[PDB]
Amino acid sequence: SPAKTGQEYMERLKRAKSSVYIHGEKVEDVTVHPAFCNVVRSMAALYDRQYEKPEKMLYRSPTTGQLVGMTFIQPTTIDELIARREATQEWARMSAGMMGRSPDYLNAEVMAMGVANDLFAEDDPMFAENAKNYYEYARENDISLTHTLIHPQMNRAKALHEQNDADVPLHLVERRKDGIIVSGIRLLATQGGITDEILVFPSTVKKSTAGEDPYALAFAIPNNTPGVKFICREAFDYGRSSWDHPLASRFEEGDAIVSFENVFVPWERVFVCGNSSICNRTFRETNAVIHMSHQVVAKNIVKTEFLLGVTLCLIEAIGIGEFQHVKDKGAEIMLVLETMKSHLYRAEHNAKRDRWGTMTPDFAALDAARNWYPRIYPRLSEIIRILGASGLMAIPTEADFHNEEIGEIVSRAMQGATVDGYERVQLFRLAWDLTMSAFGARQTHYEYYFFGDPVRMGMAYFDGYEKEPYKQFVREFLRGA
Amino acid sequence: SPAKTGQEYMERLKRAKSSVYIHGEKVEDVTVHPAFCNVVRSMAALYDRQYEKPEKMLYRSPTTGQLVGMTFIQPTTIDELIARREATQEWARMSAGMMGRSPDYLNAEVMAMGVANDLFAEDDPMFAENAKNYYEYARENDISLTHTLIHPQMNRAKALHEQNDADVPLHLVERRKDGIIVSGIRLLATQGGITDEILVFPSTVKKSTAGEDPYALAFAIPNNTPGVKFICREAFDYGRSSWDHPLASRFEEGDAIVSFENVFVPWERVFVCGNSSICNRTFRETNAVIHMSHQVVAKNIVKTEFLLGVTLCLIEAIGIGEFQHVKDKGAEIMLVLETMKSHLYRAEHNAKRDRWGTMTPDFAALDAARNWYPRIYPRLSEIIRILGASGLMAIPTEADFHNEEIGEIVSRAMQGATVDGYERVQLFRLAWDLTMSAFGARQTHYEYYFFGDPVRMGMAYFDGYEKEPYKQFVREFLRG
Amino acid sequence: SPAKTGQEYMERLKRAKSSVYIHGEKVEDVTVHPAFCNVVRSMAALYDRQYEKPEKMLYRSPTTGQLVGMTFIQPTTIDELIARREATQEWARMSAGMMGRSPDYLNAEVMAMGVANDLFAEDDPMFAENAKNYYEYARENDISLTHTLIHPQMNRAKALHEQNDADVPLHLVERRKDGIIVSGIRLLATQGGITDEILVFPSTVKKSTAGEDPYALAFAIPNNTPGVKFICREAFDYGRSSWDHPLASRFEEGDAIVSFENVFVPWERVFVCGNSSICNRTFRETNAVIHMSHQVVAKNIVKTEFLLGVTLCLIEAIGIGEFQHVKDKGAEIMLVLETMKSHLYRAEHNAKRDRWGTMTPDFAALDAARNWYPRIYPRLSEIIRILGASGLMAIPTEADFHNEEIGEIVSRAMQGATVDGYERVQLFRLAWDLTMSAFGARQTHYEYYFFGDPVRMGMAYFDGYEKEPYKQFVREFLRGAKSV
Amino acid sequence: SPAKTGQEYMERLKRAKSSVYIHGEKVEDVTVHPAFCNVVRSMAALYDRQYEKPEKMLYRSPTTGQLVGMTFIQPTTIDELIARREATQEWARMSAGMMGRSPDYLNAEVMAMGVANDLFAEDDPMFAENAKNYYEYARENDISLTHTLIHPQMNRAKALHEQNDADVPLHLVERRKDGIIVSGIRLLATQGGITDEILVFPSTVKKSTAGEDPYALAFAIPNNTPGVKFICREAFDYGRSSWDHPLASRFEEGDAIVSFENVFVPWERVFVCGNSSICNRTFRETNAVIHMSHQVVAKNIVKTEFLLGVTLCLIEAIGIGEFQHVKDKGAEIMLVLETMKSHLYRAEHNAKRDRWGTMTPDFAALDAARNWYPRIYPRLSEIIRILGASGLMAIPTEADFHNEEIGEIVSRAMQGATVDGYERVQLFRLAWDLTMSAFGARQTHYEYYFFGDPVRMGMAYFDGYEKEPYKQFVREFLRGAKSVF
């Protein structure tokens, strides 16, 4: 079976030896370096879950007949579509919705563009073939992927070609028989260099013009390709136990600058080569934004369930369940959860087959969800913070509980209404790690910016909305005077 | 009886002569008095639509075989449930979502109580039979209804029995062989005195204690019952044309104080008689809150499409649609629309049969919707006001355009980007009447307080929510 | 004595006979037409108050030495500046802060430009002289004024000269020996044609470009100037009693479209003639925006005192004063009140003399206040609406209480915790007329858009802020921790 | 000269040897432990500033005639009140407004209660004398103080005496000839065990009823009193350079649980002994909330000036200054700064003497300021987060710049519009440490909760407001339209 286990996943990262830098040093082994080993372990547990629950987490490849990841499926019926989502939710439950690049996110993108690959043939028929071959290769080899969609804009008032240093952003250096050469920088590769391969693709939102053709690239390459380096930001896993830092010590995915010094990309791994127009249409005409949104909305639901659980546990632990303002705050989170569930229900049950036979979720539902959820997420976090109150700062370590001189003092001190001190501090430390640690604050920031800047997403949502019917309804009504 | 036409509807009001008071005088005929005649004509037109499209607006009564209003249906399949909703939306589109008491709101309530009537039998088996017969009576005679759910709380820090005047709220005076006698006051009867009959029911939200048993009433009577008076608030229809006041001169429903002086109610029209515990459960255990929420969310969607339309039209007319803050304001309203359409989709397609055979909408979805939309409606209103800006105050009358001295001046002056002066003032008048007239401000207030105070609704929403799964998920996570 | 009484004020409007149109008809006499008569009587009452409280509302003219209106003063001391504001607040209290064009608002504008008129000499020295002459004329004859700053922007995605009809907005037609000819349209003359004269002036925010020179006018004319018509939007005084409509039947100021068909403006009435650059700087370099803002903040404080009053009264009548959400809403309004008073306190007591010797309020305070208050005002309105709840829709009329069949029923029905039926409906009717009548909704819209669009006002506020100090502070702090 | 230098301050802490625990172990020396050494140097530097700028930061003691700290002053004129505030702002500027328990906050409380001590005589006349004595002692020895006002609320829906464990909150155990015994816990000692003494006082907002008399204590004791332990929450200074963590590695003040095992307090250190009613009035009737509020608002202004500065630097660096949404977000911060400055101005210039002769700021201004700013602070933080966007996550370390293999790649990669890579990542790291580090989020959470829960503060503000005048105004207006039927 080509679908991989946790240890097969770790063994492939170890043998890859990608050029990865953190805290001023080259990383010898990502599987054991303190900044990465925990999140690698968490990913490994996802691959183990596929084998624990094969009937739900695997399916038969239409090309090879072997058991491959469910999250790669091309759904052709609403049942297959729901099945894909249930697999996404199983992993999302394991990571409390904290992972932005669990394999299922990229698996959806790669499938969509494999299957709906025709756009690419406008440039050359080979790029369309490459897309299909790439998806099959990814699925049949259980590749783990991230992407990078973000250029170093330096001056946002201006286009990439106008910057002081126009060569900083990733661009095409030349074309050859056997492939292409690229140089420059991409930003925010989440799980950069603890994945097998990386998709370099255009932005979801930021629409690029004719002068930016040298920057308009889509391709996928091994993380360890010669001349690629992953320069990680500072780790937010400070090496603590998962009682003390219950999230940061399990799900800290890293964000990385990606450098390309003179990187050779073989032709077979290229999808778009120096074409603003095709780039600008890639997410839309492959339907990839739809399947990517499906996964995200499903994951957001699991995550909202978790924040809700924390909120409710906090409420009970401190005995504040009877105040009106507390109940309304609880009601805010509950409404968000039901809203997201309602969009997902419509997305799946109102799905229709596209011209490639893919059962395609109703995007009117998912597009609203993905535009709304980021805007409201900071308030969900603000709610946990406000309810926890001064108790969020009363967070001694586990070690403080086991100390001979103070263990009892601390136990009695940190007592709640309905809980002993040890269980209460554990609970509050989870609320804290979710909202006020560097890991938690980053979760808020990441949800808000997940598919791009809400300011731009809002402009694009308005412009893409079918607005004529609503005018016609109002114009008829005025005519009847 | 044949389902009603518009003429039949107006004929019954005329013949009933309810005691109705407005602006300090008794009303002789509600069908011609200037405060009501326009809204009566809008109501009439809904009944006319029922006969123009019988396949969509009527169905065969399961008891008599006759065509009766679709919005009375007891849906037994998903398709019948969608069919009821489409009829509600036909009517809602004709009134741009403005009507709080189009018949379909109450028709849902009365169906739900008539079919799921067993609750009432806890006090006496006759009261459950009364609910069933009342449903059949309403459907087979195409009764138009409103209700009244709100007591005069005077001091809100206290229960009704503790007020300085304990007898002001409507309460039971005595019991008799043939019926009961009631006295006192109910508030906020929307369309009070332009309906055939009125439901007197408990609140949806506010819970009552043992000491408030004398106030715990559920019954239905004709509007013209002896001893019943409707004392109406000031009209927000100032008698202007429908170019000037395009909403207020068509859909001003009225809100009335209802007075009962020693009113006789026959036993056959009583559902709950002096029982807090039953009253507290009436909206939930009949499933009436669910079916009523179905109607409201469907109507809210039509309403939001209307607000969206107005907003977009303003944007085009003024030429502001390339500014990013304007686009984002447009986007706010669209997200609301898709949010409510998604809840409605889930409500209908995830519906299940209840013990009584009724295909019941998914209330997890409708409960969220009906709690959320009131909260967010003020913002939709605020968006129209902000976009319209100074242009909302440049609203000369139709007659100004007709005036020989100034007609041409005004036309040239009130020009827009993509519209003539006349068409532009008409559009801004619609935006104005929707948000800044007495009519429009009322629309915003009415949506906010529709099923009750959001403060109390939020508390009830929290307490009613199935919370255990979520806490268990986090506790499993903490365990390992 | 040249300061006017209420009757003198009314008799001037009657004898002036401006061309005023409302509800499809020419108005014969604004002082008795139903749409204007109440507000005219309210304005009359302000002029009467002058003479009832002369030691507070009048002062000796520096040029004639006779008693003139205090809100004309050019303050040269902090005392005289406070005195002006107390005068503003006397009138604001009589109107519950509801009037946008009480005479004091425009009186401050005309004073500031009369005194700091040197900008105008950039175009032509006579224009500076005119401004000074106009100020003295307005003060010495107690002229009541409004203004209009608003062009008919048809397509806001373009400039006035790029519109499909470029001749709709008010523009210069030609220049003659004795004056100028102007044609076109201006919007939003609040109190249009129930004042003696009108100021036609540039926007306080909207900047104009080279191509909009022909539209860049500043002048003052009598409201009855031949070729001038005031076309009023429909009145929001529907002729009710002040028990029923306590505000709309007293303070409905009107907003007029102003038409000019080949209107002649004498040169002595001109301040700016077809000059975008000078228009763009008119409010700033004259300090007019500062004195106008002083008047506005003082009036906004009065208005907030009233809203607070109404809110508290509602809370006690209904008996909800013990709910925490209710108390927090009360606290919001209180904080707004204290914020505005703080800004006024700093504005006055940190005033400094300008190069003309006018004691000039500290604009850092007033500018923040005038940017903030509009943005927060909708919420003050929302709070009254929310606390009032269902009771706001239970508004029978006075005539319902006086009807013999239903009077008693209504009285008993409408009781509150601490007030009887008649008192309760009267209070709720004031809350209603303040926030949910056409009058009330307009008040919310008027505050929000008072000095212009908050979107533009915020861009100007940011651009005009002295930002450099705060960058240097941060940059020094970073310089500490640098490596080499 | 009794005012202390930085090294006198560090020496005094080192010799006191309080019982302080963090990360599961007893701290030997708070001057050198990695969790405190940075903040201790930051406090030391405030005490050195005192001596660098004596004319502004010191004054002549009214009792001894020697030079003592200005923030202790009992102001008798508007000038002395302004001078106190300028000293507060000198220290606030060194800390970018980030320190919640710089000595000046406490010094204002202790002065207020020393001078306006009459309330305490209601229980026992010695307690009023003690408060006066305590003020002079703290001033004359330049005592650095913090306080704890928070009880372990376990079940917040119930009073302290109805808790599952009524003995957990700090309470009177017995009274003696010579003093009192207290046992139990207090919850949020900021700078616990890096000060000389701690004030144990009632809440500013939370009322206590009878039944909570055993819990209504006011006293001051040395941090090293036998039976007292400070149990610190985990450090948010993770031992990085001040280029990487520019705020967390200078101003991490620490929050401490304060434990008392049958601790002896001598009578001379007691101000309130088991009296709810007097505790409930302690902050008002001494005017201490006024002078504390003065300090906080002045500090809040310095802090807003710094957030503004960060916001504007970010906008220039990234080149986003011409977008309207960005300019409005700038304007939000400017309005807050002007609002706070206006309140402060009114507070000082409209100050009036109290019955003890202290020039007392106008509390109408300061009470609004202190209720409002906590509510608006999270928005200021969200603006920095929003504007910084993806750049906030592009934060390589200083050591990444200094690596030979990647240093130049990172410099080119992280350029801004108007700044090079190194200067840019430094700026964004300040923005990050201000809003999105453990340090940053704490700042936002501390500002919000500073003088108590806004929900309770808002109730108290409404209840305390002089409401009748506004009702009379409205009623007179209504009276005008009354029919005589």
PDB file of N, CA, C and O in Angstrom, chain B residues 21 24 156 234 238 245 318 385-386 389 393 395 400 403 405 409 417 429 436 441 445 449, chain C residues 21 24 154 156 233-234 240 245 261 318 386 389 395 400 403 405 429 436 441 445 449:
ATOM      1  N   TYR B  21     -59.700  52.507  17.641  1.00  0.00           N
ATOM      2  CA  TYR B  21     -59.508  53.915  17.930  1.00  0.00           C
ATOM      3  C   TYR B  21     -58.129  54.318  17.412  1.00  0.00           C
ATOM      4  O   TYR B  21     -57.161  53.573  17.570  1.00  0.00           O
ATOM      5  N   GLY B  24     -57.484  59.673  18.588  1.00  0.00           N
ATOM      6  CA  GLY B  24     -58.471  60.258  19.474  1.00  0.00           C
ATOM      7  C   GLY B  24     -59.923  60.039  19.045  1.00  0.00           C
ATOM      8  O   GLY B  24     -60.815  60.588  19.668  1.00  0.00           O
ATOM      9  N   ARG B 156     -40.310  46.664  35.358  1.00  0.00           N
ATOM     10  CA  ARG B 156     -39.731  45.435  34.815  1.00  0.00           C
ATOM     11  C   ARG B 156     -38.860  44.697  35.842  1.00  0.00           C
ATOM     12  O   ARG B 156     -38.503  43.544  35.608  1.00  0.00           O
ATOM     13  N   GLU B 234     -50.246  56.340  16.897  1.00  0.00           N
ATOM     14  CA  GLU B 234     -50.200  57.249  15.774  1.00  0.00           C
ATOM     15  C   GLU B 234     -49.736  56.518  14.513  1.00  0.00           C
ATOM     16  O   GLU B 234     -48.770  55.760  14.524  1.00  0.00           O
ATOM     17  N   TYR B 238     -48.720  59.168   6.514  1.00  0.00           N
ATOM     18  CA  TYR B 238     -49.144  60.561   6.641  1.00  0.00           C
ATOM     19  C   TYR B 238     -50.038  60.957   5.456  1.00  0.00           C
ATOM     20  O   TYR B 238     -50.301  62.140   5.263  1.00  0.00           O
ATOM     21  N   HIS B 245     -43.816  58.335  -0.424  1.00  0.00           N
ATOM     22  CA  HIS B 245     -43.633  57.408   0.686  1.00  0.00           C
ATOM     23  C   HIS B 245     -43.887  55.972   0.203  1.00  0.00           C
ATOM     24  O   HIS B 245     -44.952  55.399   0.424  1.00  0.00           O
ATOM     25  N   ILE B 318     -25.002  57.039  -7.790  1.00  0.00           N
ATOM     26  CA  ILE B 318     -24.132  58.061  -7.231  1.00  0.00           C
ATOM     27  C   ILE B 318     -22.714  57.922  -7.786  1.00  0.00           C
ATOM     28  O   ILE B 318     -21.953  58.888  -7.764  1.00  0.00           O
ATOM     29  N   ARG B 385     -27.979  54.247   5.080  1.00  0.00           N
ATOM     30  CA  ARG B 385     -27.998  55.634   5.514  1.00  0.00           C
ATOM     31  C   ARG B 385     -26.676  56.314   5.144  1.00  0.00           C
ATOM     32  O   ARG B 385     -26.684  57.402   4.573  1.00  0.00           O
ATOM     33  N   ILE B 386     -25.551  55.652   5.461  1.00  0.00           N
ATOM     34  CA  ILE B 386     -24.203  56.154   5.230  1.00  0.00           C
ATOM     35  C   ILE B 386     -23.919  56.326   3.733  1.00  0.00           C
ATOM     36  O   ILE B 386     -23.350  57.329   3.337  1.00  0.00           O
ATOM     37  N   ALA B 389     -25.911  59.285   2.201  1.00  0.00           N
ATOM     38  CA  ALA B 389     -25.226  60.506   2.595  1.00  0.00           C
ATOM     39  C   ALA B 389     -26.150  61.709   2.392  1.00  0.00           C
ATOM     40  O   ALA B 389     -27.329  61.608   2.689  1.00  0.00           O
ATOM     41  N   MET B 393     -31.263  63.693   2.173  1.00  0.00           N
ATOM     42  CA  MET B 393     -31.971  64.872   2.633  1.00  0.00           C
ATOM     43  C   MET B 393     -32.470  65.716   1.451  1.00  0.00           C
ATOM     44  O   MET B 393     -33.344  66.559   1.631  1.00  0.00           O
ATOM     45  N   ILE B 395     -34.774  65.491  -0.844  1.00  0.00           N
ATOM     46  CA  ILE B 395     -35.961  64.734  -1.216  1.00  0.00           C
ATOM     47  C   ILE B 395     -37.133  65.700  -1.384  1.00  0.00           C
ATOM     48  O   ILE B 395     -38.039  65.781  -0.548  1.00  0.00           O
ATOM     49  N   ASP B 400     -43.248  68.799  -6.513  1.00  0.00           N
ATOM     50  CA  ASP B 400     -42.228  69.777  -6.866  1.00  0.00           C
ATOM     51  C   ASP B 400     -41.825  69.608  -8.328  1.00  0.00           C
ATOM     52  O   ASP B 400     -41.597  70.591  -9.019  1.00  0.00           O
ATOM     53  N   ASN B 403     -44.359  71.144 -10.733  1.00  0.00           N
ATOM     54  CA  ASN B 403     -44.589  72.573 -10.575  1.00  0.00           C
ATOM     55  C   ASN B 403     -43.962  73.282 -11.768  1.00  0.00           C
ATOM     56  O   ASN B 403     -42.854  72.937 -12.175  1.00  0.00           O
ATOM     57  N   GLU B 405     -42.970  76.472 -12.216  1.00  0.00           N
ATOM     58  CA  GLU B 405     -41.848  77.360 -11.957  1.00  0.00           C
ATOM     59  C   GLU B 405     -40.558  76.553 -11.777  1.00  0.00           C
ATOM     60  O   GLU B 405     -39.507  77.000 -12.239  1.00  0.00           O
ATOM     61  N   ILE B 409     -35.822  72.952 -13.057  1.00  0.00           N
ATOM     62  CA  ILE B 409     -34.712  73.209 -12.162  1.00  0.00           C
ATOM     63  C   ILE B 409     -34.430  71.957 -11.335  1.00  0.00           C
ATOM     64  O   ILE B 409     -33.302  71.482 -11.301  1.00  0.00           O
ATOM     65  N   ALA B 417     -25.171  60.090 -11.592  1.00  0.00           N
ATOM     66  CA  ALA B 417     -24.227  59.507 -12.523  1.00  0.00           C
ATOM     67  C   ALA B 417     -24.990  58.922 -13.710  1.00  0.00           C
ATOM     68  O   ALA B 417     -24.788  59.365 -14.830  1.00  0.00           O
ATOM     69  N   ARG B 429     -35.840  58.353  -2.094  1.00  0.00           N
ATOM     70  CA  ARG B 429     -37.046  58.326  -1.282  1.00  0.00           C
ATOM     71  C   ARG B 429     -37.317  56.919  -0.759  1.00  0.00           C
ATOM     72  O   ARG B 429     -37.746  56.752   0.382  1.00  0.00           O
ATOM     73  N   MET B 436     -35.132  55.980   7.466  1.00  0.00           N
ATOM     74  CA  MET B 436     -35.095  57.258   8.179  1.00  0.00           C
ATOM     75  C   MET B 436     -36.471  57.901   8.330  1.00  0.00           C
ATOM     76  O   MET B 436     -36.593  58.940   8.977  1.00  0.00           O
ATOM     77  N   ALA B 441     -37.567  53.590  10.517  1.00  0.00           N
ATOM     78  CA  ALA B 441     -37.042  53.430  11.871  1.00  0.00           C
ATOM     79  C   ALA B 441     -37.805  52.328  12.587  1.00  0.00           C
ATOM     80  O   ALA B 441     -37.192  51.519  13.276  1.00  0.00           O
ATOM     81  N   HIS B 445     -36.477  48.716  14.281  1.00  0.00           N
ATOM     82  CA  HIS B 445     -36.814  48.406  15.664  1.00  0.00           C
ATOM     83  C   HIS B 445     -37.586  47.095  15.756  1.00  0.00           C
ATOM     84  O   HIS B 445     -37.408  46.332  16.703  1.00  0.00           O
ATOM     85  N   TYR B 449     -36.669  43.504  17.713  1.00  0.00           N
ATOM     86  CA  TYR B 449     -37.453  43.020  18.838  1.00  0.00           C
ATOM     87  C   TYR B 449     -38.502  42.002  18.408  1.00  0.00           C
ATOM     88  O   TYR B 449     -39.392  41.691  19.170  1.00  0.00           O
TER      89      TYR B 449
ATOM     90  N   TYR C  21     -39.996  77.330  -2.082  1.00  0.00           N
ATOM     91  CA  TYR C  21     -40.959  76.359  -2.568  1.00  0.00           C
ATOM     92  C   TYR C  21     -40.907  75.143  -1.653  1.00  0.00           C
ATOM     93  O   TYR C  21     -39.816  74.667  -1.330  1.00  0.00           O
ATOM     94  N   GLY C  24     -44.598  71.425  -3.593  1.00  0.00           N
ATOM     95  CA  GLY C  24     -45.127  71.719  -4.920  1.00  0.00           C
ATOM     96  C   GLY C  24     -45.649  73.148  -5.088  1.00  0.00           C
ATOM     97  O   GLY C  24     -46.231  73.454  -6.113  1.00  0.00           O
ATOM     98  N   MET C 154     -22.659  64.431  -8.952  1.00  0.00           N
ATOM     99  CA  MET C 154     -23.616  63.572  -9.609  1.00  0.00           C
ATOM    100  C   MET C 154     -22.960  62.200  -9.694  1.00  0.00           C
ATOM    101  O   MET C 154     -23.474  61.238  -9.140  1.00  0.00           O
ATOM    102  N   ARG C 156     -19.695  60.739  -8.168  1.00  0.00           N
ATOM    103  CA  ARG C 156     -18.644  61.052  -7.208  1.00  0.00           C
ATOM    104  C   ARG C 156     -17.286  60.497  -7.668  1.00  0.00           C
ATOM    105  O   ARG C 156     -16.254  60.862  -7.105  1.00  0.00           O
ATOM    106  N   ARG C 233     -36.860  70.258   0.721  1.00  0.00           N
ATOM    107  CA  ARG C 233     -37.345  68.888   0.856  1.00  0.00           C
ATOM    108  C   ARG C 233     -38.639  68.907   1.671  1.00  0.00           C
ATOM    109  O   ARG C 233     -38.982  69.936   2.255  1.00  0.00           O
ATOM    110  N   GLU C 234     -39.388  67.799   1.683  1.00  0.00           N
ATOM    111  CA  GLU C 234     -40.651  67.808   2.403  1.00  0.00           C
ATOM    112  C   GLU C 234     -40.326  68.015   3.872  1.00  0.00           C
ATOM    113  O   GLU C 234     -39.311  67.515   4.342  1.00  0.00           O
ATOM    114  N   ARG C 240     -48.216  68.422  14.110  1.00  0.00           N
ATOM    115  CA  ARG C 240     -48.738  67.904  15.366  1.00  0.00           C
ATOM    116  C   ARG C 240     -48.407  68.851  16.520  1.00  0.00           C
ATOM    117  O   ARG C 240     -47.609  69.771  16.368  1.00  0.00           O
ATOM    118  N   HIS C 245     -45.320  65.479  19.134  1.00  0.00           N
ATOM    119  CA  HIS C 245     -44.046  65.603  18.436  1.00  0.00           C
ATOM    120  C   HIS C 245     -43.269  66.739  19.085  1.00  0.00           C
ATOM    121  O   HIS C 245     -43.333  67.870  18.598  1.00  0.00           O
ATOM    122  N   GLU C 261     -30.350  81.250 -11.082  1.00  0.00           N
ATOM    123  CA  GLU C 261     -30.463  81.503 -12.509  1.00  0.00           C
ATOM    124  C   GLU C 261     -29.890  82.888 -12.799  1.00  0.00           C
ATOM    125  O   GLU C 261     -30.492  83.885 -12.417  1.00  0.00           O
ATOM    126  N   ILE C 318     -39.300  52.697  33.673  1.00  0.00           N
ATOM    127  CA  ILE C 318     -39.487  51.307  33.299  1.00  0.00           C
ATOM    128  C   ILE C 318     -38.941  50.394  34.408  1.00  0.00           C
ATOM    129  O   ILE C 318     -39.201  49.197  34.406  1.00  0.00           O
ATOM    130  N   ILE C 386     -32.819  51.089  22.102  1.00  0.00           N
ATOM    131  CA  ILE C 386     -32.756  49.770  22.708  1.00  0.00           C
ATOM    132  C   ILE C 386     -33.401  49.731  24.094  1.00  0.00           C
ATOM    133  O   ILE C 386     -34.129  48.795  24.399  1.00  0.00           O
ATOM    134  N   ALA C 389     -37.358  50.071  23.802  1.00  0.00           N
ATOM    135  CA  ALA C 389     -37.919  48.769  23.467  1.00  0.00           C
ATOM    136  C   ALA C 389     -39.374  48.914  23.000  1.00  0.00           C
ATOM    137  O   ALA C 389     -39.684  49.907  22.346  1.00  0.00           O
ATOM    138  N   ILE C 395     -47.326  54.386  21.482  1.00  0.00           N
ATOM    139  CA  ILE C 395     -47.381  55.838  21.508  1.00  0.00           C
ATOM    140  C   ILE C 395     -48.733  56.265  20.957  1.00  0.00           C
ATOM    141  O   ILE C 395     -48.829  56.699  19.814  1.00  0.00           O
ATOM    142  N   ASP C 400     -56.046  60.662  22.234  1.00  0.00           N
ATOM    143  CA  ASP C 400     -56.475  59.390  22.795  1.00  0.00           C
ATOM    144  C   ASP C 400     -56.733  59.521  24.303  1.00  0.00           C
ATOM    145  O   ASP C 400     -57.761  59.042  24.805  1.00  0.00           O
ATOM    146  N   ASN C 403     -60.121  61.420  24.966  1.00  0.00           N
ATOM    147  CA  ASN C 403     -61.351  60.820  24.468  1.00  0.00           C
ATOM    148  C   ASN C 403     -62.075  60.206  25.661  1.00  0.00           C
ATOM    149  O   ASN C 403     -61.452  59.548  26.485  1.00  0.00           O
ATOM    150  N   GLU C 405     -64.373  57.735  25.879  1.00  0.00           N
ATOM    151  CA  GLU C 405     -64.518  56.286  25.915  1.00  0.00           C
ATOM    152  C   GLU C 405     -63.199  55.622  26.328  1.00  0.00           C
ATOM    153  O   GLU C 405     -63.223  54.658  27.076  1.00  0.00           O
ATOM    154  N   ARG C 429     -42.567  59.427  23.859  1.00  0.00           N
ATOM    155  CA  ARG C 429     -42.749  60.218  22.651  1.00  0.00           C
ATOM    156  C   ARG C 429     -41.579  61.161  22.386  1.00  0.00           C
ATOM    157  O   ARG C 429     -41.233  61.377  21.229  1.00  0.00           O
ATOM    158  N   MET C 436     -36.456  58.062  16.162  1.00  0.00           N
ATOM    159  CA  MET C 436     -37.179  57.166  15.280  1.00  0.00           C
ATOM    160  C   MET C 436     -38.214  57.907  14.435  1.00  0.00           C
ATOM    161  O   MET C 436     -38.837  57.308  13.573  1.00  0.00           O
ATOM    162  N   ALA C 441     -34.412  60.574  13.057  1.00  0.00           N
ATOM    163  CA  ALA C 441     -33.466  59.890  12.194  1.00  0.00           C
ATOM    164  C   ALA C 441     -32.597  60.939  11.512  1.00  0.00           C
ATOM    165  O   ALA C 441     -31.395  60.757  11.390  1.00  0.00           O
ATOM    166  N   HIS C 445     -28.448  61.555  11.290  1.00  0.00           N
ATOM    167  CA  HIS C 445     -27.771  61.676  10.007  1.00  0.00           C
ATOM    168  C   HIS C 445     -27.024  62.997   9.935  1.00  0.00           C
ATOM    169  O   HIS C 445     -25.944  63.080   9.345  1.00  0.00           O
ATOM    170  N   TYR C 449     -22.858  63.581   9.555  1.00  0.00           N
ATOM    171  CA  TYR C 449     -22.360  64.228   8.349  1.00  0.00           C
ATOM    172  C   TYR C 449     -22.176  65.730   8.559  1.00  0.00           C
ATOM    173  O   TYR C 449     -21.998  66.452   7.602  1.00  0.00           O
TER     174      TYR C 449
END
